[PDB]
Amino acid sequence: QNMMRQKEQEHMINWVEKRVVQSISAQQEKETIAKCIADLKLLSKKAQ
Amino acid sequence: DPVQKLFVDKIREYRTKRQTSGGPVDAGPEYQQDLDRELFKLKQMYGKADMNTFPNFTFEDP
Amino acid sequence: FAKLVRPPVQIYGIEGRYATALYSAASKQNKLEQVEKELLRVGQILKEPKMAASLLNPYVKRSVKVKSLSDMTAKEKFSPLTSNLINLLAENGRLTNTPAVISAFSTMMSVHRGEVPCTVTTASALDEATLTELKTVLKSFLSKGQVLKLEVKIDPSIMGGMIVRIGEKYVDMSAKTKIQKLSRAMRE
Amino acid sequence: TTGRIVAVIGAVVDVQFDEGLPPILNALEVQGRETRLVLEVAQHLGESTVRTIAMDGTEGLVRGQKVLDSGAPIRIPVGPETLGRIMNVIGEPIDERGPIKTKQFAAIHAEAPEFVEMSVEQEILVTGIKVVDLLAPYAKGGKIGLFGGAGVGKTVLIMELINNVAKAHGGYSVFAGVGERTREGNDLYHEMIESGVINLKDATSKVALVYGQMNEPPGARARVALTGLTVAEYFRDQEGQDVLLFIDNIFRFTQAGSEVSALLGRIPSAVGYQPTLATDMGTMQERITTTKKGSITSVQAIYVPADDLTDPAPATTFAHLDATTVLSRAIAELGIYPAVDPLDSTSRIMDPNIVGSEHYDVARGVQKILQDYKSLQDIIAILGMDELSEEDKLTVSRARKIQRFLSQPFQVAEVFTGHLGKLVPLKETIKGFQQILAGEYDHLPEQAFYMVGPIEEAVAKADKLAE
Amino acid sequence: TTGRIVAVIGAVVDVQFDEGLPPILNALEVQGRETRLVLEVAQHLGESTVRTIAMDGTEGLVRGQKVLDSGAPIRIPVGPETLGRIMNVIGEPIDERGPIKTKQFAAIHAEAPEFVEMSVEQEILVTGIKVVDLLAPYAKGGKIGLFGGAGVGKTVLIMELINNVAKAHGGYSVFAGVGERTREGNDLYHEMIESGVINLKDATSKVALVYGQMNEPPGARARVALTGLTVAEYFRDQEGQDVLLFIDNIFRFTQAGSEVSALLGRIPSAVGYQPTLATDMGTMQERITTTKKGSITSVQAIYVPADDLTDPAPATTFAHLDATTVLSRAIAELGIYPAVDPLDSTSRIMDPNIVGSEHYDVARGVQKILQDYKSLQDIIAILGMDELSEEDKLTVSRARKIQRFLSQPFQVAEVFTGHLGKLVPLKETIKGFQQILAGEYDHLPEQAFYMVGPIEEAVAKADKLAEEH
Amino acid sequence: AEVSSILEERILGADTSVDLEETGRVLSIGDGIARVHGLRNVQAEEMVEFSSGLKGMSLNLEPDNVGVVVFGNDKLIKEGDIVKRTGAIVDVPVGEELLGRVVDALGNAIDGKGPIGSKARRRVGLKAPGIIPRISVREPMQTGIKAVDSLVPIGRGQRELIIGDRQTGKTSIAIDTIINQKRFNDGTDEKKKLYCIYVAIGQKRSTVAQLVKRLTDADAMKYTIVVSATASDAAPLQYLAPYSGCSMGEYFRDNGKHALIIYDDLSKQAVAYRQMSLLLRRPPGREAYPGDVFYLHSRLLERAAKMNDAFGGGSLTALPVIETQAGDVSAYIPTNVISITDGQIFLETELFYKGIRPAINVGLSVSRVGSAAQTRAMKQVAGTMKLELAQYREVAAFALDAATQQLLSRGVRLTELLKQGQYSPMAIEEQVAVIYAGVRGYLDKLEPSKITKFENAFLSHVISQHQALLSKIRTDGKISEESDAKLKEIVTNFLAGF
Ligand SMILES: Nc1ncnc2c1ncn2[C@@H]1O[C@H](COP(=O)(O)OP(=O)(O)OP(=O)(O)O)[C@@H](O)[C@H]1O
Numbered sequence A: 001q002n003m004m005r006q007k008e009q010e011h012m013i014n015w016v017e018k019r020v021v022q023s024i025s026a027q028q029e030k031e032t033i034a035k036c037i038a039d040l041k042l043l044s045k046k047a048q
Numbered sequence B: 001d002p003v004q005k006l007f008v009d010k011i012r013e014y015r016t017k018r019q020t021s022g023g024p025v026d027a028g029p030e031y032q033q034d035l036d037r038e039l040f041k042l043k044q045m046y047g048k049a050d051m052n053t054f055p056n057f058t059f060e061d062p
Numbered sequence C: 001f002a003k004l005v006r007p008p009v010q011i012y013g014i015e016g017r018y019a020t021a022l023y024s025a026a027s028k029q030n031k032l033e034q035v036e037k038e039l040l041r042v043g044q045i046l047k048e049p050k051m052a053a054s055l056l057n058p059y060v061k062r063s064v065k066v067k068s069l070s071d072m073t074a075k076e077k078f079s080p081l082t083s084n085l086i087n088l089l090a091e092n093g094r095l096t097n098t099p100a101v102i103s104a105f106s107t108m109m110s111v112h113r114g115e116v117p118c119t120v121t122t123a124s125a126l127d128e129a130t131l132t133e134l135k136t137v138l139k140s141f142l143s144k145g146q147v148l149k150l151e152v153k154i155d156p157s158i159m160g161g162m163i164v165r166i167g168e169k170y171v172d173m174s175a176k177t178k179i180q181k182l183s184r185a186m187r188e
Numbered sequence D: 001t002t003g004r005i006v007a008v009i010g011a012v013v014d015v016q017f018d019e020g021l022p023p024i025l026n027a028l029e030v031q032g033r034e035t036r037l038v039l040e041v042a043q044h045l046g047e048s049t050v051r052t053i054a055m056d057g058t059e060g061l062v063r064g065q066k067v068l069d070s071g072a073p074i075r076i077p078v079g080p081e082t083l084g085r086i087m088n089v090i091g092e093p094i095d096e097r098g099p100i101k102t103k104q105f106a107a108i109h110a111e112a113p114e115f116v117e118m119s120v121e122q123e124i125l126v127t128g129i130k131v132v133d134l135l136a137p138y139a140k141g142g143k144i145g146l147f148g149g150a151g152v153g154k155t156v157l158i159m160e161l162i163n164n165v166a167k168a169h170g171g172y173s174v175f176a177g178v179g180e181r182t183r184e185g186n187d188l189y190h191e192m193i194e195s196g197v198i199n200l201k202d203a204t205s206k207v208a209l210v211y212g213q214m215n216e217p218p219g220a221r222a223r224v225a226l227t228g229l230t231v232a233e234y235f236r237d238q239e240g241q242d243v244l245l246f247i248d249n250i251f252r253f254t255q256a257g258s259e260v261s262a263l264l265g266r267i268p269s270a271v272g273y274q275p276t277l278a279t280d281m282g283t284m285q286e287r288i289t290t291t292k293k294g295s296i297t298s299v300q301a302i303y304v305p306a307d308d309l310t311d312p313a314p315a316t317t318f319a320h321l322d323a324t325t326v327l328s329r330a331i332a333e334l335g336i337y338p339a340v341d342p343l344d345s346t347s348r349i350m351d352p353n354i355v356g357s358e359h360y361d362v363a364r365g366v367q368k369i370l371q372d373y374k375s376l377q378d379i380i381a382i383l384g385m386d387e388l389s390e391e392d393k394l395t396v397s398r399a400r401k402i403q404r405f406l407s408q409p410f411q412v413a414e415v416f417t418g419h420l421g422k423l424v425p426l427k428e429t430i431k432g433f434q435q436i437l438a439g440e441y442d443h444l445p446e447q448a449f450y451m452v453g454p455i456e457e458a459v460a461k462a463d464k465l466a467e
Numbered sequence E: 001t002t003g004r005i006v007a008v009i010g011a012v013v014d015v016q017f018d019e020g021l022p023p024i025l026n027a028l029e030v031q032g033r034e035t036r037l038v039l040e041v042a043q044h045l046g047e048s049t050v051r052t053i054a055m056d057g058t059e060g061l062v063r064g065q066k067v068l069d070s071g072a073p074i075r076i077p078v079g080p081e082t083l084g085r086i087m088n089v090i091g092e093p094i095d096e097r098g099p100i101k102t103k104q105f106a107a108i109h110a111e112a113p114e115f116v117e118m119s120v121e122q123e124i125l126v127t128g129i130k131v132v133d134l135l136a137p138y139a140k141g142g143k144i145g146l147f148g149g150a151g152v153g154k155t156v157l158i159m160e161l162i163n164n165v166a167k168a169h170g171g172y173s174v175f176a177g178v179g180e181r182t183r184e185g186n187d188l189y190h191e192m193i194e195s196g197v198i199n200l201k202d203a204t205s206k207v208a209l210v211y212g213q214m215n216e217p218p219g220a221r222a223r224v225a226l227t228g229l230t231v232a233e234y235f236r237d238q239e240g241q242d243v244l245l246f247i248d249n250i251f252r253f254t255q256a257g258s259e260v261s262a263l264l265g266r267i268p269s270a271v272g273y274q275p276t277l278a279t280d281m282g283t284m285q286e287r288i289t290t291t292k293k294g295s296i297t298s299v300q301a302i303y304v305p306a307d308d309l310t311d312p313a314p315a316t317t318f319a320h321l322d323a324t325t326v327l328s329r330a331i332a333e334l335g336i337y338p339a340v341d342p343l344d345s346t347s348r349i350m351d352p353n354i355v356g357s358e359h360y361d362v363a364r365g366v367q368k369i370l371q372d373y374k375s376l377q378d379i380i381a382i383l384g385m386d387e388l389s390e391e392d393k394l395t396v397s398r399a400r401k402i403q404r405f406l407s408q409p410f411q412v413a414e415v416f417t418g419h420l421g422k423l424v425p426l427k428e429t430i431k432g433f434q435q436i437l438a439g440e441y442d443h444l445p446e447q448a449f450y451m452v453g454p455i456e457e458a459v460a461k462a463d464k465l466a467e468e469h
Numbered sequence F: 001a002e003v004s005s006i007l008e009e010r011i012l013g014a015d016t017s018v019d020l021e022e023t024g025r026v027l028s029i030g031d032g033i034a035r036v037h038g039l040r041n042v043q044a045e046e047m048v049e050f051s052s053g054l055k056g057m058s059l060n061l062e063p064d065n066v067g068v069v070v071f072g073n074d075k076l077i078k079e080g081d082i083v084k085r086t087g088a089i090v091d092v093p094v095g096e097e098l099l100g101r102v103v104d105a106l107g108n109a110i111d112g113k114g115p116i117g118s119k120a121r122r123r124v125g126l127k128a129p130g131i132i133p134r135i136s137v138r139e140p141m142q143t144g145i146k147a148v149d150s151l152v153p154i155g156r157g158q159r160e161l162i163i164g165d166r167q168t169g170k171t172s173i174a175i176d177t178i179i180n181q182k183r184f185n186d187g188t189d190e191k192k193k194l195y196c197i198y199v200a201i202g203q204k205r206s207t208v209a210q211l212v213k214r215l216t217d218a219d220a221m222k223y224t225i226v227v228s229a230t231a232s233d234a235a236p237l238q239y240l241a242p243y244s245g246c247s248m249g250e251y252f253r254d255n256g257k258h259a260l261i262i263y264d265d266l267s268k269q270a271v272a273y274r275q276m277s278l279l280l281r282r283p284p285g286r287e288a289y290p291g292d293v294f295y296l297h298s299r300l301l302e303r304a305a306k307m308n309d310a311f312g313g314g315s316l317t318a319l320p321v322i323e324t325q326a327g328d329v330s331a332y333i334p335t336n337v338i339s340i341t342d343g344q345i346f347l348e349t350e351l352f353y354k355g356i357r358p359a360i361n362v363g364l365s366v367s368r369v370g371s372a373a374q375t376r377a378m379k380q381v382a383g384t385m386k387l388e389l390a391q392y393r394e395v396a397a398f399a400l401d402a403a404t405q406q407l408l409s410r411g412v413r414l415t416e417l418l419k420q421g422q423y424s425p426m427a428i429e430e431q432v433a434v435i436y437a438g439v440r441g442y443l444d445k446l447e448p449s450k451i452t453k454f455e456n457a458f459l460s461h462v463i464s465q466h467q468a469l470l471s472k473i474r475t476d477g478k479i480s481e482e483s484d485a486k487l488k489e490i491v492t493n494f495l496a497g498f
């Protein structure tokens, strides 16, 4: 049982990481840059 | 927390795998070959006894 | 000894020592801008193929090299500081690393006029409006009077997001690092 | 990518890439050579320069020559199609029999097995050699090390072990000859071809050979142990089989390093050795373990410089072995062969819970009597053997009888001496030493035990001496 | 003045000053440390940088940390208020008892006394130890050495001396533990508290302690000897009184000097030692002296690495000592304790005109008989005892009796032997050895003489052995 | 089904926070040492991290660059990489959560079995306790070997040294000490429980696996931590494993508990430190070891203290293991560590092969504590045994009169009494019984080849018939007159009946 658990674990791991690396190519630039610039502004506000 | 698009992305991929896990998807022949290899090795290291139930004894007195 | 005025950014090595000497010499007498311009000039003057070929040969005596450099400096009407610096580099045989000295002084003067080099890395290019808000926020990071020197490279190796370097400060909102973080923590 | 050579010093080449730098251990190809010259990267020097070690002769490299990044470390062909072949550092066949056709390549720089993969099983491997089997019993799946100076019997012993163990072995086998004579490799190749262990015209070959012999530069000797390690790792992990891995001579792997370390601008260690001696030895030697995925029974011949066991190289190797076998030049000068020193040789499975109680008791009795004789030797040498009590004379006689009896005639030495090779099953060894220890054979001449098989052959020899 | 750390490599810190530099040997204080970290200047590297050795751990130092220049070498509190306390190299107390409240601070670096201050008088110091008193007698105001490897009795012997001389000594005393186990420091603290030399209630303490134990970075071990030496020097001069000064070991000073030399840019010398070994040791051992203003009796324990008396450190230390007692492992294996080697120990006062003709003749007779015994041992290894000239057996018997009779039970080694400590007055030791040589005891067995005080105790032990025979 | 559920449970909790952190660019990486440029505020011996999640320590702070040592493999670090300072001196997890776990030099679980639940971290480079906190060593550390518990006793807070050649039985002594503590840890009182830490430096992973399975078989991982920095672990890890383990033991001794730590070996930590120092370009010393090679160990073995009752009363014993070359105790690291430690236990190959196992050379083995840290019964009996062996060793080189013949007989009987097997440590009262039988002229009648048979049979007989007497000896902790009379009659009866 333990070997099945861990091996299905690893297969899970690889499958998911692939799927995400294909997905991340998606069109989210404008929104991502907006949120990241917001994060930069917040980090600057804490900085000083 | 609803903002980490990759957080929800990974959760989504996980959910899809959960739904599609009727049989190990993208298993390939390597899945079966490994499974067989290490099951065989475990079978040796444990033993060849009657792999359903309790084997009997028929001990011997002194 | 003479209490030299230290440069803002410490450059180290042979070029560092020569450039720090030049910066200390110029800072008193207040000739930093003119001497930097003269350094940029000699950056091309020595680069001339004839002069470069005549200065990278160690079999022309140091006497001839110093004489030629004195003639060039006189023909270019330089400050005594730059002429003496070139003479000093020639006597010590340090001409092969003269461009290193000019680069060091350029780095040292840029910080003097308040500049913090910056780097931005993304999977793809950016729209000028987004770059404008980036300029604004990054200027928010800086202090008063500290001009910014942005550089926007494009690295497709990362899967998205953004990476920002401001001096030694670093913020990594890139897809790749977050994928790595989740994969590792989840693997544990 | 594309860089240009900037420096070429010995076997160490500096390459400057203006575009993307190659990672470490990554291999590069020098473009413009008659043959394939591979440069393994080793350092990043700053200023977009990488120092590299050349896997072949560097004569003819011109400053400014072009080097092309390959993107992956040295990848060699692995599979069941590398059996019966001969390979070199970079996986190129050198038997002149055609390209090694495999569908799967292995990088030679993999990492060692993790901790959750080790196997704790400890069996005994019977080699048919009295001294090895009695005092330093080799274990199946463990590491074995034959320490010995020059010309004491390392290769003869390892060939005897090849013969015995790998004739009775159903699994595969891999001989990596790193830094040894080329004619020895040729003799091994032809002995296997004759002995059926290699079929040039079939697919029933059970030995894969790799060869980085002494004639090759330091960069090839350094990284040829890793090629054999990879060929064996495949047969262990993937094929899930039990492999034999003979290495001869592993000292030449560390020695070669100290040849390039000097040129890599590293401060030398205790005796001219690279500062990274133990780390490199560890990373090489922890890939030869028997994990849960399979088994590797590695036998390594180790050369002791100037017969100095205090040297950093053998002294460091000692900590990476289950069983050791310290061949000694003095014993070889006495005529004993194999020259195994019964007191330096050790083993992990010399435990009454593994070998038994008669085996353990006999081994300890032999060692005790030999140690007593060693203690007496200094006085015996000057005062003479007349200033000894009777118990001491009995100890001397028994110890000499035992010393002679540990000698054995190998089959690989049939050509040398004309004797007949002998195998001595474990029970016969234990029984014979029991009898000698008890004193059953105090009436025989000590030269009746010299180079015999089981003890009954010693008795027959003694009878023949009477005539 | 204020400077700025620019490099940290091991225990060596490079500090850059924009104003005027501080002179060599000055103490600098790092700003931004919870505890007190003191660096000591060791070199001027030019370009306004100064190299320094840190008197404490250099963990958590940041390139750029500001540094203050105290303007003077490390100044320790000195005076009668340091008695009964414990101190670091930098003088702050480590006995968890409050600040040391003195009016005088003394810098730990000072010039040695000039040649016109040396006392030239020697008189035996009777310690109560048979071997020491007979063969290598000590001297008031003289420097004593205790050589020997590890595990031979250096610490036990020095503790025994503190037990005898310091307890019944009117003047003050100082103990500088240099690079030794902290367990031993605590054991000594508690043993002294028990005896009463350190009084935690009144102001009647007679011992001042300084500790630089082997957990400290090399900078502190190389200077705790100077701190203890400064305390002793003050008690010598201002108090104008006798002082004792025990050091254990004075090899850790040299060794700690060797652990930083390579990082200060010096090429090494004969065996991984700093090029300045002899000079560095001399500039310290030359302040431990009996000038005409005071008198320091200095006892030093000197580790001999691997029993090698020809190592550069002990070899150099030999020339700075009046008396030496070379403890030997080959004698400690035999069970003769203290393991002082009678043939490898010497003293300056060991002359017939300082001790007397009887004392001198007894000592020389003992040494000669032991050397003859050593010569005979080579023959006995071949012949055997049964084949010696009936006169030689007499020499061997006398030599073994004398070898055993030099052993003595200490009051501090009760735990090991279980016996009781004995103090043997000098006349009794001379009488005992003169009688043993003269043959007045050539019938008592050897073991009667083992671990006893005066000779009469050997007679009584022999009587007991015979009765329960 | 639930496998993926628990997989998700991990993602559900992540590290969203991205902070503005100081950094530096790797000017040059090679041989395991990086030269970072930047990190202007990085501390000394601080922990930094690389772009691939790989850690390192900033060991050199030069004016122009920071020399960083990588705690792991080095092939993954390129030039122009990014090094982020974590702003924390190197520290490791500590607590009872680590017991029974195999961890690497940095406190990462190595056997799977999930993560460590440690709630507290401790800095590896902490100063040793002062002079005032400590208190003289009082309790005995029960090792289980007769020859160590009788002739070279070890207290709690002492720092013994096990020094010998290769394959003389040093790790065996360490494992016997670890296993013996099972009887005390199973009991009730917490003043005897001793938690064991085993630091395995430079040992191949197979050896540590064998050791861990051996401890598991003896059910000794309930209280053992194993900190393994094996041969294939980069030198910066083998250099730091002793300090990590010593911090894990410092936690126990600082929290009123008792701990035992076993560095194995220190002669390999010295080699790893030498490699580090030579690759940072620091000038070499004697035998190429850096100058600070004594400090390296002295600062490490000085943390094995015995706190007084005001500071909890906890203790931390240390048993460093050194390896000499052909018995050359006079070498560099052996002499350093011998002059650092309290006692010593000399194992000799000439004794190992002559049949004396453990090979402890009782002639040279020492223990400063000696009298103290020994039970009263053992103190009574081992004293006479020590005198008898001391006399025997003098007249031993040969082999007439009745007195000396009987002296040799008694010496030999005691010698064969001290032998022992592997992983079978004895309770102290059992050792007292055996040594008492041997030293009271009882075995002088028997042959010396049969003494092992006696020892074994006598133990088996007493452990069942006379459990009450052993309990009496343990509880009262001395051989009272009535206990002595009993012991006398039991031995007299058994000797004839055998
Ligand atoms: N008391 C004993 N009785 C019998 N055999 C022993 C005993 N102690 C040790 N041995 C034997 O000695 C061998 C080496 O033991 P051990 O590993 O303890 O020594 P070591 O010096 O630590 O080895 P290494 O240093 O190579 O790791 C073991 O195989 C064991 O069988």
Ligand SMILES: Nc1ncnc2c1ncn2[C@@H]1O[C@H](COP(=O)(O)OP(=O)(O)O)[C@@H](O)[C@H]1O
Pocket: D148, D149, D150, D151, D152, D153, D154, D155, D156, D157, D337, D338, D408, D409, D410, D413, D416, D417
């Ligand atoms: N079984 C044996 N019988 C006789 N001689 C042997 C035997 N084994 C080794 N030798 C001796 O060893 C020599 C070969 O040494 P070898 O092992 O080839 O050198 P190396 O130690 O460099 O491998 C032979 O000349 C032979 O005299």
Ligand SMILES: Nc1ncnc2c1ncn2[C@@H]1O[C@H](COP(=O)(O)OP(=O)(O)O)[C@@H](O)[C@H]1O
Pocket: E149, E150, E151, E152, E153, E154, E155, E156, E157, E337, E338, E410, E413, E416, E417, F366, F367, F368, F369, F370
């Ligand atoms: N006077 C003595 N009597 C008996 N044993 C002693 C005596 N002095 C030292 N020893 C032995 O030496 C050990 C202590 O040695 P010590 O002097 O502390 O070491 P070092 O001299 O190397 O500092 C003790 O364990 C003890 O057995």
Ligand SMILES: [Mg+2]
Pocket: D154, D155, D156, D180
């Ligand atoms: Mg050979």
Ligand SMILES: [Mg+2]
Pocket: E154, E155, E180
């Ligand atoms: Mg001492």
Ligand SMILES: [Mg+2]
Pocket: F170, F171, F172
């Ligand atoms: Mg071991």
